[PDB]
Structures are given as C-alpha cells and as structure tokens.
C-alpha cells in the first residue's frame, strides 16, 4: 500500500516530579504551642 | 448583463450558469424587462408621486 507516510504514537508520558517549595507550619500548628495558647488565663 | 461575467447572475445560485453567458436572445428579453422597469420608474417619479413618497 504505497500511500502517505505518517506515524501515530499517543503521548501519555508522565512529567518529572515538580518538587515544589514546601510550606512552613505555623507555631500554632504544633501541639505544645496550642496547649500553651488555649490554657491562657 | 449576460455578456460581462462579473456583472451577471452568480453561478452558485443557478444550475444552468454554464450555458447562459453569450446568449443574445435571452439578453434581448432581459433588456426588454429592464426598459419596462425604467419606464415604470420614470412614470412613478415624474407623474404620480413627484415628491418621491414610496409608501402607499
């Protein structure tokens, strides 16, 4: 079958890991500061 | 106008556009129609409605 030459290859390639910047937990995200803040007089 | 191509009927609206251009009898008929129209225009514009009112 001498006709138009074309190659079909589906692209589903996974991207490389992004490694985005990491959020920093608040001081009130730790159990001991939470206890100190809630137990305030 | 059946002689000039760009002043004729569009070819996509009629099936027989091929065998229309260059015909002289059909051009005679069209010329008679146009002369009748021009006579009507003159009669309406110069006798009946001189002020040009066309809604009657």
């Amino acid at each position: 079958r001498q006709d138009y030459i074309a190659k079909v290859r589906y692209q589903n390639d996974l991207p490389a890991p992004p490694c985005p910047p990491k959020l920093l937990k608040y001081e009130i995200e730790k159990e001991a500061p939470q206890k100190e803040f809630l137990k305030d007089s | 106008d059946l002689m000039d191509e760009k002043n004729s009927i569009k070819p996509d609206v009629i099936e027989y556009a091929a065998d229309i251009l260059g015909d002289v009898e059909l051009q005679k008929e069209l010329n008679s129609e146009y002369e009748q129209l021009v006579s009507d225009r003159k009669f309406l514009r110069e006798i009946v409605f001189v002020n040009g009112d066309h809604n009657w």
Binding site: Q2, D3, Y4, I5, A6, K7, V8, Y10, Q11, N12, D13, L14, A16, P17, C19, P20, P21, K22, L23, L24, K25, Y26, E27, I28, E29, F37 | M3, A18, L21, G22, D23, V24, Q27
Partner: protein
C-alpha cells in the same frame, strides 16, 4: 466557627486574633487558595511588624502558585530578611528551607543560580533528597541523560524514597534505549516499589500500565491466542489504571491510558469523550495531538485539522515536522473524501514546508504521492470544474513527482521498495501524463468556444442597434 468569631469581633470592635486567620488559611489550602491567601494577607496586615518567617514564606508560595513571580519574589526576599531574627535552634532548618525555595524560584527564572544554590545546600545538608533530585534532574536536562551513574547512586542512597524512585523511573523511561538497559528492569523496579514500599502509589502503577501497553502493542498478532495475550496485557494495564482511579478518580493520566487502550480496541467514542474531558481539564501538546488522532479515527477531518493547528501554534510553535505531517495527512483525507482541490493544495504546501525544514525521503515520497493524487483528481474533474492553470500545475507536479520517484528508487533504503517506486513512476508517465494533455486540449477547446460565443454576440448586438 472561625467566621462567626471574626464577625462577632468585628461587631464588638475587638482585635481579631491572626491565629484564626492562619487556621482558616490552613483549612482553605485544600479548598480555596484564593481565600487562604486573602486571610493570610489580612493576618499579615493585623501583625504589621509582627510578621513571621512562616507567614512570608506561605505568602510567597501562594503567589508562586498564582504565578505572581514579582510578588512571590518580594515575599521570599522579606522572608530571607526576617531570617536574621529567627531563633538559632530553628535558624539552620529555616535557612535551608528558604534557600531551597529561592533555588526553586531561580530554577523557574534562571537554572544557573538554582544549580549554584543547590550545590550550596547539598554541601550544607547532603542528606536532603529534593535538592539532590532537582540538581541531578537539571544536570540530566543539560547532559541529555548522560549521568545515569548519578541517578543510580541517588537511587541507592534512598531506596525507600518515593520521590527518588519516581525520578529514577522517569529517567529510565526517558533514556532506557539510550543506556541499553533491560526493558523489564524498570518494570521490576516498580513492582518492587509497589509490593515492598507502597501498593497505592499511582506513579509506579501508571508506569507499569504504560510498559504493559507498550509490550502489548509491540506484540505481533497471528491468531486468537496472541490477540488474547495482548488483551490480557491491556487488561493488566487497565487494572493498574483502575486501581489508580480507586486511589484518586481525578487522575487525567489514567483516563488517557484508558482512552489509548480503547483506541487500540477501536472504542473511538469513549476515547473521544475522555480526550475532550482531558482537554477541558488540562491543555498540553499531547492532549491536542491525541484529539487530532481521535478525530482522524472519527472521520472528523476538519476538527482534526483545527486540533493539529492549535497543537502546532501553542506548543511546538511551528517547528516539529510530525505535526506538519499530521496536518498534511488530515488535509489529504479531507480532499479525498470531500473531493476538494484546495485541501490538496494546502496539503501540498504543508508537505513542501515540512520537507524544506527536513529534506527527508519520507517527505519526498509524501510530496510525490500528493502530486500524483492531485493529477489524478484534476484529470477526473470535468472541464467546467477546472481551468488551464490547474492543469498546467498538475502536469508540472506530475513531472517533478516522477523525477523524485526515480530519485527515491535510487536511494539505499527508500520508504517503499524501489521496484514499487519505479513501477508507480512508469504507470504515471505512461497513461496519466497523456490524459493530462488530453484534458488540457479539451479545456483549451472549451475556452475557445466560450470566447467565440462572447465575440459573436457583441457584433450582432451592434448590428441591431
């Protein structure tokens, strides 16, 4: 409750605690980044000079996710300035984190400073993995995957790290044939990752599904048994994707693999629906290419042309030859199925541009085939539906196509056997060439008759006048 507290404090004219704002932003991180960022801004405004390093870092990350490069950079600079006030105990950790964030921002802006800060942090803390992963990834980008030893060493350093294993598997998928490694080696690595570390990791499951689909596609079909084995491999890949969807139904890549399997199984409608949903979700070059392929399989050649054009303009920027090949094929399909000459002209021009970009035997044969089809279609056309210019162009294209067919037959490994090329050139020259000249003569006779009628009418009109 936090909104009620905020409202009550506002009604009472009492100072709203910024801790409630931080908690609200933390909650909205998984719901609405906009509301979380707004609450963080309100908390920072309340604090004034009491702004901390974490608040500035989170504001910078919010603006980075919002693509606010200027504002993110300003917030990161303010965080680095405030780092001087950090307690010494956490100072080292927060400095490492802020330097990593700044290196990420540089990698977005300029990779050189990112690599410099990566080396700085690696000397500061060799145990960190993300820094090493990004540095080795940038090196592989610069070295075209010539640092496989570094990737293997990093994999050995953290065999239990999911990020390290995923990066190593990505590098394998990228350059396994370049490195000559085992085809199933990455499959065994991902199988070990799933069995011994985490069986719910969608990355390794998708990699295994892609490997199994590739194996099934490359498998030769000879009888029912081989087709059933291929279907079983596709079923394994589909089970990988279904487990991924069970883990997370919002996985675009699992649906894309499902659509590819359906394309192999000729379930065109489901693949088309999946690809449309994916395009609505995310817009990359692969999605547009797959949409064009599906439209070609769905016989919607115009939509395929549009999809390929959008893919070419948005991402490839008119440089890739494969997209031009696809556009030419779609145009040829449109011209063949719809009997349109302008489609053939556009396909010919696209093929000519692609060849001038590449000058490969495949595109030479494509041009020859297009010209032969053009000549055949023009000969098949009636006189009233064509003109002399198209006939002359078709004849010239036929001559050039015959010459290029001989050229291809003189090549070492032409896309088609040289005997077939020579036979086609001979067949085109023997009969089609003469039929083109006969059509040219008939067209000239038709034009002459038209002009004779036009010149005869005016003389009779003048005589009547």
């Amino acid at each position: 409750f936090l909104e009620k507290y905020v409202a009550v404090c506002q009604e009472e004219n009492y100072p709203i605690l910024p801790e409630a704002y931080l908690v609200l932003s933390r909650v909205y991180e998984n719901k609405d980044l906009n509301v979380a960022l707004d609450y963080l801004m309100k908390a920072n405004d309340i604090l004034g000079d009491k702004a901390n390093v974490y608040v500035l870092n989170n504001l910078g990350i919010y603006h980075f996710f919002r693509n606010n490069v200027s504002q993110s950079s300003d917030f990161f600079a303010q965080s680095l300035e405030a780092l001087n006030n950090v307690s010494p105990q956490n100072k080292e950790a927060l400095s490492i984190t802020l330097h990593y964030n700044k290196a990420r921002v540089e990698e977005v802006s300029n990779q050189s400073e990112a690599e410099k800060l990566y080396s700085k942090l690696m000397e500061k803390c060799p145990g960190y993995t993300s820094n090493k992963i990004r540095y080795i990834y940038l090196l592989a980008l610069k070295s075209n995957g010539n640092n496989y030893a570094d990737v293997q060493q990093l994999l050995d350093d953290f065999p239990s790290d999911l990020e390290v294993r995923s990066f190593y598997g990505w590098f394998l998928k990228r350059y396994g044939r370049k490195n000559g490694l085992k085809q199933d080696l990455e499959s065994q690595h991902h199988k070990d990752t799933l069995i011994n570390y985490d069986k719910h990791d969608c990355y390794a499951l998708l990699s295994l599904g892609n490997i199994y689909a590739t194996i099934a596609r490359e498998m030769k079909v000879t009888d029912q048994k081989q087709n059933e084995i291929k279907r079983q491999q596709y079923l394994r890949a589909a089970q990988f994707y279904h487990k991924v969807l069970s883990i997370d139904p919002k996985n675009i890549y699992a649906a894309q693999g499902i659509a590819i399997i359906f394309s192999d199984k000729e379930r065109t409608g489901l693949a088309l629906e999946i690809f449309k949903k994916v395009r609505d979700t995310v817009q990359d070059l692969g999605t547009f290419i797959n949409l064009g392929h599906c439209f070609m399989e769905a016989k919607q050649f115009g939509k395929a042309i549009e999809s390929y054009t959008i893919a070419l303009e948005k991402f490839s920027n008119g440089m890739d030859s494969k997209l031009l090949v696809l556009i030419g094929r779609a145009w040829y399909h449109r011209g063949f199925y719809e009997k349109s000459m302008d489609a053939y002209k556009k396909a010919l021009e696209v093929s000519e541009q692609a060849y001038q970009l590449s000058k490969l035997p495949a595109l030479r044969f494509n041009i020859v085939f297009i010209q032969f089809q053009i000549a055949d279609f023009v000969k098949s056309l009636p006189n009233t539906q064509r003109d002399l210019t198209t006939l002359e162009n078709a004849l010239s294209g036929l001559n050039d196509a015959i010459k290029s067919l001989l050229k291809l037959a003189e090549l070492e490994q032409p896309p088609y056997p040289s005997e077939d090329l020579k036979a086609r050139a001979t067949m085109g020259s023997n009969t089609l060439r003469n039929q083109l000249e006969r059509a040219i003569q008939d067209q000239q006779d038709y034009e002459m008759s038209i002009q004779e009628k036009l010149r005869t009418a005016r003389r009779k009109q003048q005589l009547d006048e």
